[PDB]
Amino acid sequence: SLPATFDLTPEDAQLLLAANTHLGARNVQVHQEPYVFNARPDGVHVINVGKTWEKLVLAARIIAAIPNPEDVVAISSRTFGQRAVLKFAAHTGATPIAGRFTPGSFTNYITRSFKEPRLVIVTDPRSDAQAIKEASYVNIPVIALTDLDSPSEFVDVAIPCNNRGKHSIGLIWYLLAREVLRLRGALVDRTQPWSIMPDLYFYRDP
Amino acid sequence: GKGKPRGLNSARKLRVHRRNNRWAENNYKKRLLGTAFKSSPFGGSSHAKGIVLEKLGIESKQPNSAIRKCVRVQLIKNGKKVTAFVPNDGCLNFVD
Amino acid sequence: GWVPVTKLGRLVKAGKITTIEEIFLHSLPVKEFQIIDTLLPGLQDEVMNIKPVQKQTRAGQRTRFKAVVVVGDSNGHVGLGIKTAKEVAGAIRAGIIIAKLSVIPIRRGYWGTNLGQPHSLATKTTGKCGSVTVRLIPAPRGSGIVASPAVKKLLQLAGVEDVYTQSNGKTRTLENTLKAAFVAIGNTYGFLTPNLWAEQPLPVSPLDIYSDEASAQ
Amino acid sequence: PKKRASNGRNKKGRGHVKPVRCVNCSKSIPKDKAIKRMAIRNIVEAAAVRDLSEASVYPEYALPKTYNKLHYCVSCAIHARIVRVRSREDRKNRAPP
Amino acid sequence: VLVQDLLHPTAASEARKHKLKTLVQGPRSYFLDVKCPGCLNITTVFSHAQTAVTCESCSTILCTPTGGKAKLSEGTSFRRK
Amino acid sequence: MRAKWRKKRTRRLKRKRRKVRARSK
Amino acid sequence: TRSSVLADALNAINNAEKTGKRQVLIRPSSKVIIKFLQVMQKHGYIGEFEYIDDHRSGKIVVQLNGRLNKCGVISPRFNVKIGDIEKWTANLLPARQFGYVILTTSAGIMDHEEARRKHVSGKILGFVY
Amino acid sequence: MENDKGQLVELYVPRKCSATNRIIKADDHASVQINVAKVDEEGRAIPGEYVTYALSGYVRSRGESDDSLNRLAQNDGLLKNVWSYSR
Amino acid sequence: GRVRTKTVKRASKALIERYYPKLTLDFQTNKRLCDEIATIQSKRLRNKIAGYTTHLMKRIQKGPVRGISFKLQEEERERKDQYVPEVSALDLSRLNVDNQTSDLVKSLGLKLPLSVINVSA
RNA sequence: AGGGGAUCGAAGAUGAUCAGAUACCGUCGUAGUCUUAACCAUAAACUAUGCCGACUAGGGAUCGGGUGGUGUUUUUUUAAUGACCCACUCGGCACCUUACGAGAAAUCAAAGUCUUUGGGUUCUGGGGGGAGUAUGGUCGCAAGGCUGAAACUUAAAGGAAUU
């Protein structure tokens, strides 16, 4: 369906390999097994970045299908994805939930942090398990940045990527932001990359 | 297989099992042993007549304090002596 | 007056939904009882149980009151609300709200041939709550609702007019009996019959078609 | 009702293990049910080590250790604050400290 | 997984599985043609021979019984089938 | 009274009954 | 021991339907299992089913379309007369309109409605809906 | 269903799980509907036309929602080779 | 026993939230500000509210205080997180791979300057 | 019924405590505790969970057997057998997570595949007491075991959880 421009370019694979997004966990769960490619000695399993890129483009095709960009919710409790989710919030509509989730944000329609969105994207099904459980009450589809050990409970679209490296978390959010800009008029030509490199999606120190 | 046999040729086992287990029922035990005909003041009848032997003042069970005004009756067809209630306000002066 | 706060409320208030069947079709969660009032104006309700529940405290028992309320028109909708409150009237009023928020559809069918309008249940169905299991069996025309008075009232408010009912467990536990019966009529659309095997083109929810008038700035 | 899945002990596959006697009261205890603590003390103290160090031949010789395995019944262990009765969820934890 | 091809599993999956638990059960054992050091006679040997198989030349041991596959006598040469 | 002391009292009572039945025979 | 291979097969299919799987393996694949599955296949309750021929007794992989609610056996195979067929369909089937009691009859293994058209009766095998 | 003279008499017709064909009930609050935007030439989302899949609450509760969505998208060409029929 | 209650604390936070430019680091003029930017029904409560406000400002000057987001420290946060570390940390520094991950690039067919390296067992 | 009888120790003795203490505590101490040849046949003999068979979810560890590493130990030129490591597999004692599913709940991978009720088969229960009593039979040297009522009496007894 998608043309040849919708493929893993060498420069896209350059960023994924340089950000260690292909380094999976050492304990693969049975649901994340289709993303295992010749598990490496020293224990680390290697993620199929081609299968990752296909999932990331499909995730974008769901994100760039909600008519109103504001009621797309992107969630990252962990500090590594905190700046990535906020920059994703700035570039797109994407009302962010960075830090604590405040239980009762998808239910409990009277809270200040109440949101009633069409789609939630969480950086971690383990660290954002409250939001996923919350989404299961009000029919919210979920896209989760999943490693090979993170659970796939109520996760419709899992993106197989490393969850430990701050480079990996910032890049996947940056790549997801680029594609949803690409499938719209903000980034009219797909072959041309942005004017700003990915390192503003990375958690900085101190 | 939930206990009981399910064989198509196990009717005897199921019939004897029900026959033996029906003896745990009070009405079946009472009827088949014939306790009403044998160990009962009446002889299995609804009513029985008898001669009054004495008037009794039965102190009611707690938590009720009263006197129930019963009588001692010796049945005619048995000779068994039983206690009977006089069921209305007064009416013990009628019995004699 | 009512000011909506949810997307479903703000979109029902604008008149973009005129029937409750769309919400049932797209499984949309209902959070405001005003949505049920707007879409089902003729929703008669009868309180069915008032019992006092006591919580022991150092200075005597603190007594509240639990109200069981069933809402529903006689055309395929029922709701069941359980609510405890200090006051009897407050428990009834808040129980009416929860019963309206629990409004579900029932499937009505024919015991035999499909002559006329549906009069019974499409299939047998069972619901369980606690030890109480309520089984509902399709009945021919003129049989009436063969049920206990509590189960009968829920089914009269369902629109079904011909049913056979079988029950088990401690049926005197009224809240569990009605909840078990409410689950059985909820499961009636859960069953898949051959006349529902034909595939459908999966319609898009109204929350995206009419998404311009949701969550206004 | 049942309090513990491991009924009160560590015995699944045996039927009988062996009785051991409590140190404090000499109650017969199944060996797996007994609360067992290893007793490792210095031969002297924490404060008299220096006192023996300058009052002994063979300077800094060994400072030996005293070794003992203590077997307690349930009541003696509880009374001596060895196991310290826990909550219903916290008693499922099997970690030593 | 709720969707998989029970008629065409991967050959690696069936290799890991037990010999009785494959789609069609079959032996994982084989037969061997052994070259005894003394001469050039061929004695067919089962992989799990479970007995001290002998030729007519080296009449001591051509394989050693074990709990599983037989242990060929440390000086021989063998080929499968 | 636990069942076993009720059991012990009944067992001792039973062999008082079959001891007095021994004299009567 | 394995008393009813048909009960083993239908239990495997029920557990596969409940878990949402679209396939299930069946061992050891008797003729009754093949005949029972063909009635299911005829009425759309299952999809394809293939028979692995090992030389022992065969294996079956059935393709499940998700349209089947329950398929049990009635053990023992009670003798069913023409008048008793309606009593069995009332007890086991959810509705009068759909579902089928499967019978083994000298005319062949068939559902209860086909048994009425041929006016035959025999022993009951199971049910499907 | 329908009565004798046609005229379908049924409150509504329920959706089905695109993975397991189960009926999505009105109380199935874990069930979701996934809309994927169809893409024209030179990569635009075409706002309005979607490829839609429905996943029931049970499949997502059991964790196979990702794998089921991988299969349905691959069957419709939305994914190329991520999903494998054999394991 | 001098722990300020929620009435003092919530009013002090709400005051700094919308009046940070007007305020200072002196309670003597902070108390005067309170009467003419807020309605306090007593002088003792005003001194408590203004006193904790000055204590809040003394903490704000040396590092931020969580829960208070006035104007000035907000736009400082956008000018700081807008920083991107030059052009590095993903640009090539000369891309090292193992044999297994090099096979990904082979299986995808892509041609990149890969360098297979030996890892410890 | 013989042997043996150190220790502890129903009985018993004695010193304390206590209002009393024929209990706990202390000190002795017969039978017993050990064994041989016979009896007994009972335990909270328990997982309070019959046996056989099939299926339904994830994980790590462990015991025994096996299979494969161009693995380590014997790093001594391409380095036996055991020991260990890694990946599988069969069988076993168990465990952890979750609750598909079940349950009244506690909880449970069986206590699941149960009103959508049927894989095969054995045994047992029918409110609480009276009562495992009386009587009869049978076994036993005895203690007792197995079997096993009725009259009568009663509105609860009981299970799990909440405050």
Ligand SMILES: [Mg+2]
């Ligand atoms: Mg207790």
Ligand SMILES: [Mg+2]
């Ligand atoms: Mg024992």
Ligand SMILES: [Mg+2]
């Ligand atoms: Mg016993």
Ligand SMILES: [Mg+2]
């Ligand atoms: Mg027992």
Ligand SMILES: [Mg+2]
């Ligand atoms: Mg074992």
Ligand SMILES: [Mg+2]
């Ligand atoms: Mg009784």
